[PDB]
Amino acid sequence: ETKSYYQLPLMNRLLWVEQVAVPDYLAGNGVVYQTSDVQYVIANNNLWASPLDQQLRNTLVANLSSQLPGWVVASQPLGSDQDTLNVTVTGFHGRYDGAVVISGEWLLNHQGQLIKRPFHLELKQQKDGYDEMVKVLAQGWAQESANIAREIS
């Protein structure tokens, strides 16, 4: 009966982070739990406090800002000569064995020059429950932000 809501915590050269694309199964209200090799279930009582695609974008901006001191990173356009970052997140969920999964692809554009990279991370949840699942998803999303920053540097 208890309803719980979740938020990912929020942490020159110009970098505009565009809207993060997510598929339908991750774009609902509920956090996703993969119950088997084939099935992903949307929780009914454990929900994102704001749209996951917005949370992914805002935390990516904050995470990138903290590791790129020579850059200005924003979710709103910054300048005509800016670089752009477009991300698709195809996995962002817990799994029946205690793993959490983060997957997708990012595309950096500098005046038409491109770097396009897939990502896939899997982390183990140490304690049970949706709180820990989301904590570990946020940790993995921060790790992916570090991967992108290392490339951007």
Side-chain angles (χ1 to χ4, degrees), residues 2-153:
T2 290
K3 212 92 158 183
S4 298
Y5 291 81
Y6 298 88
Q7 189 95 347
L8 305 177
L10 280 173
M11 179 83 68
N12 301 280
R13 304 200 178 119
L14 307 181
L15 180 64
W16 177 34
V17 181
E18 305 198 25
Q19 285 190 12
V20 175
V22 298
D24 287 356
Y25 87 105
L26 290 169
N29 299 277
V31 307
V32 174
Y33 196 67
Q34 179 183 353
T35 55
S36 73
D37 63 340
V38 300
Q39 184 188 60
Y40 299 77
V41 179
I42 298 187
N44 293 311
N45 304 302
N46 288 271
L47 313 174
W48 297 110
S50 61
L52 178 60
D53 66 347
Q54 298 178 212
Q55 298 206 39
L56 291 167
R57 184 191 198 176
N58 291 339
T59 55
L60 181 54
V61 167
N63 292 340
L64 287 176
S65 291
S66 72
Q67 36 219 353
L68 296 171
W71 289 72
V72 182
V73 185
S75 62
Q76 291 307 120
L78 288 164
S80 22
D81 291 328
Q82 65 198 357
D83 289 358
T84 67
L85 183 64
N86 280 91
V87 186
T88 301
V89 168
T90 60
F92 206 76
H93 54 269
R95 193 173 64 196
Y96 60 87
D97 59 348
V100 303
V101 181
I102 297 178
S103 65
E105 188 158 36
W106 58 267
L107 175 70
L108 179 67
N109 183 320
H110 167 76
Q111 295 179 352
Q113 308 178 305
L114 308 176
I115 293 293
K116 186 193 281 190
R117 298 293 182 261
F119 57 94
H120 190 140
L121 299 82
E122 296 202 358
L123 298 74
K124 270 283 303 173
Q125 212 177 301
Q126 291 161 3
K127 295 179 179 184
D128 212 333
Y130 282 116
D131 181 277
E132 302 285 357
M133 191 187 90
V134 172
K135 180 176 192 179
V136 181
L137 282 164
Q139 294 174 347
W141 190 235
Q143 177 67 24
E144 179 52 26
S145 300
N147 285 346
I148 295 164
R150 279 201 292 269
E151 280 266 31
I152 288 181
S153 292

